[PDB]
Design a protein around this nucleic acid. Structure first.
Ligand code: K
Ligand code: K
Ligand code: K
Ligand code: MG
Ligand code: MG
Ligand code: MG
Ligand code: MG
Ligand code: MG
Ligand code: MG
Ligand code: MG
Ligand code: MG
Ligand code: MG
Ligand code: MG
Ligand code: MG
Ligand code: MG
Ligand code: MG
Ligand code: MG
Ligand code: MG
Ligand code: MG
Ligand code: MG
Ligand code: MG
Ligand code: MG
Ligand code: MG
Ligand code: MG
Ligand code: MG
Ligand code: MG
Ligand code: MG
Ligand code: MG
Ligand code: MG
Ligand code: MG
Ligand code: MG
Ligand code: MG
Ligand code: MG
Ligand code: MG
Ligand code: MG
Ligand code: MG
Ligand code: MG
Ligand code: MG
Ligand code: MG
Ligand code: MG
Ligand code: MG
Ligand code: MG
Ligand code: MG
Ligand code: MG
Ligand code: MG
Ligand code: MG
Ligand code: MG
Ligand code: MG
Ligand code: MG
Ligand code: MG
Ligand code: MG
Ligand code: MG
Ligand code: MG
Ligand code: MG
Ligand code: MG
Ligand code: MG
Ligand code: MG
Ligand code: MG
Ligand code: MG
Ligand code: MG
Ligand code: MG
Ligand code: MG
Ligand code: MG
Ligand code: MG
Ligand code: MG
Ligand code: MG
Ligand code: MG
Ligand code: NA
Ligand code: NA
Ligand code: NA
Ligand code: NA
Ligand code: NA
Ligand code: ZN
Lengths: 81, 151, 50
RNA sequence: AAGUUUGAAAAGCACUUUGGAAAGAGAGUGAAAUAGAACCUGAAGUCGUGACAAAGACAAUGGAAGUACCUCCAUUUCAAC
RNA sequence: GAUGUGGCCUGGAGGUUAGGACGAAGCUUAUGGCGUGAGCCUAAGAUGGACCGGCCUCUAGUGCAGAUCUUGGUUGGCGUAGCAAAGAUCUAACGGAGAUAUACUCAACAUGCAACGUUGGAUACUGGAGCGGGGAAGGAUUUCGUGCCAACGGCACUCGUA
RNA sequence: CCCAACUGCAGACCGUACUCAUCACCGCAUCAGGUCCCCAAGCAUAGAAUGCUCUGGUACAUAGAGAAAGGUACACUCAG
RNA sequence: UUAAUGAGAUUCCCUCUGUCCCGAGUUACUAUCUAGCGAAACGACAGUCAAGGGAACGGACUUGAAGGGCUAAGCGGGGA
RNA sequence: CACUGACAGGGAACGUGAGCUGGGUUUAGACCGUCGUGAGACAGGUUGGUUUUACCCUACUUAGCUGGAAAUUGCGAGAA
RNA sequence: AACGUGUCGCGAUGGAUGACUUGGCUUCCUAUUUCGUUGAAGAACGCAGUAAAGUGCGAUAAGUGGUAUCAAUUGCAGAAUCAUUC
């Protein structure tokens, strides 16, 4: 019946890890990610979840290049004589 | 520390144990029965409780425990033989005897004058009940402190 | 002293189950010295494991 | 969910003794270990212990008047004052 | 239900006047005194260790017994209900701190019980649609050796997928 | 340059432990539930029924003592 | 209307029986005692009755009658 | 219908469901008649349809310990 | 008697209160202030003598170079010099 016994009938996976976000939201069968919409070029972004936007926005990661370019802009692209 | 101090400090020996991992209710009755006893006769009683020829009287935490004829010597009807609490209390008495011997006292003249069992901090486990319920499975350790004085 | 490891190795070397492996009740301190299949094979040859 | 808020400083309890150990008993540091490491202060509730008060069964609590006993409480008085 | 109160209390601000290492706040009370009361004040701490009181005015997230109120902790029930499907273990030796553990008296019983792991014997079960031997899915080091027993394996462990 | 029999040299990448369940997966858990495939002995017997047994595996599922009432049972019997 | 079929609804007969007259005896596992472990529900405060009034069915109130204290195993009258 | 001396009438929350049972009544499934355009309706008929919890306090039944006449005290002194 | 009750002294359990505050919230201002195919944001692996997380960094990996600055870093260890610099 539904409940405990049917819990043992659940086999396989609907989602695996996504190449773009690594969130385990990549629909194996449909071949698209539920979290970032990969392989669509643009990501998922909805204003009905501002909390979800703040989890993935700029500054929540490393900003490896943005840190460098911000310093260059703040110093007006200083170069040696 | 100890809730009471001995009359003569130099003629006394103290022993303590914290978080015993013996049932507080069982150790409460096992330790209280030897409160006014000479040390040697208290140690004899614990040996006979292990031999099941005498019992520990359960005076407070005795809700629906069995009845035995060995509780009559204590003026009660209900008693038990808590072997786990007896061996721990046997170890505590041995420590107290060692403290007395190191101080130059005679353990054969030592009389227990203070026994105090207190509930320690509990440890948490869980048990699984019907309809997917999770319910506490607490363990209740005890603190035991005592001292004995020369007679 | 536990001879679980030697019994496991002896059972594999002899190609039989645990019930058919006999370890000498005496001479247990030299059986427990055999930590390898080479040393267990010597116990079998010496008759300490049958 | 979670302040690592010990102490001014780790000076974080050498060493002796019992214990398989955890620990206890001593001894030391420190102004203070009841400041001993999730360590300032440490409430309420609940519990243990010693001492005492007694108390039938009127569930207990409560009100008003007394009394017995206690009182680490307050004030007054102590010479014809 | 309305209103009044040089009526009480709390966190901050502008003033004023004080206190504190000879001990501030907080906390404790058979500590008494004052007030009809909200409360205020003193005493003691065998409490604490650094801030804080009075008065005038200003200000506000300003007073709790209950909302099947929220969060944390505690609690009687209570050593109680129970820990009863899958038949089952016994014995000696070894190992282990886990013993044959003792004031007097006392030959041993009647005063150290109960429990562990391994090996050899004994007995039994699974009974090839197996508590057999290999794989997929799922899990991801649970595998192996040594060591170890604080927590965990709802009893236990010296054992362990700890 | 192309065939035959040799011969010489080189054969790159990832997976590989363990488990697959009355403890390793899902069911909050070492949960009497659930979960695909292969190999499958002897005797009785029509036999993959059922019962017992060699091999392999196991003695792990809290135990001891032990005739109250009343219970539960994949336990029985009962005159007329 | 209908042969065959049906874990479908109904009536009767044979057989059979503890369904009953009318209960009795036995077994395993419990309950029960012990060692270890150890909850929950529920919990204003509590808990002997009769009558009376009363929100018209009181554990508390009135007037009577009981009631020494503490306990183990049960039990289902009340605790609307 | 039958026996009998007789087969009286009633109350106790129309006594009594943590005592049972669940046939009826009164969910969801389904059939018929009547009604309704219809969804549906019918104190009309029919068939199928989870009955949970006591370990607390009293009450009751048995089963233990145990003080107390100033009903624990006063020394407060009463003899069927 | 025993359970049980009450009070006081002392303990335990339990972490409220006060003091503390490198945090939050709110308001205001100053700019040669606005990323990416010259590969961004995000995601994943790795890097220390010792290093799980976090931080920093990218096989030149808890960092290379250059300017200043002037003797450390620090749990332990290691380290030419005790330092104009290299
Ligand atoms: K007034
Ligand atoms: K709560
Ligand atoms: K009908
Ligand atoms: Mg399916
Ligand atoms: Mg199926
Ligand atoms: Mg699909
Ligand atoms: Mg596909
Ligand atoms: Mg019982
Ligand atoms: Mg009992
Ligand atoms: Mg359960
Ligand atoms: Mg479940
Ligand atoms: Mg000093
Ligand atoms: Mg202090
Ligand atoms: Mg302090
Ligand atoms: Mg403290
Ligand atoms: Mg308290
Ligand atoms: Mg007290
Ligand atoms: Mg009253
Ligand atoms: Mg009075
Ligand atoms: Mg405020
Ligand atoms: Mg001021
Ligand atoms: Mg006081
Ligand atoms: Mg008081
Ligand atoms: Mg004030
Ligand atoms: Mg408010
Ligand atoms: Mg409050
Ligand atoms: Mg409520
Ligand atoms: Mg309790
Ligand atoms: Mg029980
Ligand atoms: Mg059961
Ligand atoms: Mg079984
Ligand atoms: Mg054996
Ligand atoms: Mg003996
Ligand atoms: Mg023994
Ligand atoms: Mg068999
Ligand atoms: Mg069988
Ligand atoms: Mg076969
Ligand atoms: Mg199999
Ligand atoms: Mg292993
Ligand atoms: Mg266990
Ligand atoms: Mg391989
Ligand atoms: Mg393999
Ligand atoms: Mg398999
Ligand atoms: Mg799982
Ligand atoms: Mg899950
Ligand atoms: Mg079969
Ligand atoms: Mg067969
Ligand atoms: Mg076999
Ligand atoms: Mg199992
Ligand atoms: Mg078994
Ligand atoms: Mg079980
Ligand atoms: Mg029975
Ligand atoms: Mg009545
Ligand atoms: Mg009832
Ligand atoms: Mg019952
Ligand atoms: Mg009725
Ligand atoms: Mg009537
Ligand atoms: Mg019912
Ligand atoms: Mg009925
Ligand atoms: Mg009823
Ligand atoms: Mg019915
Ligand atoms: Mg019609
Ligand atoms: Mg019906
Ligand atoms: Mg119907
Ligand atoms: Mg049916
Ligand atoms: Mg008297
Ligand atoms: Mg790039
Ligand atoms: Na049992
Ligand atoms: Na299972
Ligand atoms: Na049918
Ligand atoms: Na009532
Ligand atoms: Na009355
Ligand atoms: Zn994605």
């Amino acid at each position: 019946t539904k409940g405990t016994t049917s819990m043992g009938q659940r086999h396989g996976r609907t989602h695996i890890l996504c190449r773009r976000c690594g969130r385990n939201s990549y629909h194996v069968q449909w071949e698209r990610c539920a979290a970032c919409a990969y392989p669509r070029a643009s990501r998922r972004r909805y204003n009905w979840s501002v909390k979800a936007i703040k989890r993935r926005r700029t500054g929540t990661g490393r900003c490896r290049y943005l840190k460098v370019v911000n310093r260059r802009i703040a110093n007006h692209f200083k170069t040696p004589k | 520390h100890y809730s009471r101090k001995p009359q003569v400090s130099s003629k006394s020996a103290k022993a303590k144990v914290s978080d015993l991992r013996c049932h507080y209710k069982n150790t409460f009755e096992t330790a209280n029965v030897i409160n006014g006893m000479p040390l040697r006769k208290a140690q004899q009683l614990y040996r006979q409780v292990l031999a099941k020829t005498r019992c520990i009287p359960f005076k407070r935490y005795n809700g629906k425990i069995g009845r035995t004829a060995q509780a009559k010597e204590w003026g009660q009807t209900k008693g038990r033989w808590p072997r786990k609490s007896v061996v721990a209390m046997m170890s505590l008495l041995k420590n107290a005897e060692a403290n007395a011997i190191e101080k130059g006292l005679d353990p054969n003249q030592m009389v227990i004058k203070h026994v105090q069992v207190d509930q320690a901090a509990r440890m948490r486990r869980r048990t699984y009940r019907a309809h997917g319920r999770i319910t506490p499975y607490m363990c209740s350790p005890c603190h035991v402190q005592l001292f004995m004085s020369e007679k | 002293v536990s001879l679980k490891l030697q019994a496991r190795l002896a059972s594999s070397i002899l190609g039989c189950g645990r019930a058919r492996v006999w370890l000498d009740p005496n001479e247990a301190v030299e059986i427990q010295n055999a930590n390898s299949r080479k040393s267990v094979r010597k116990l079998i040859k010496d008759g300490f494991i049958i």
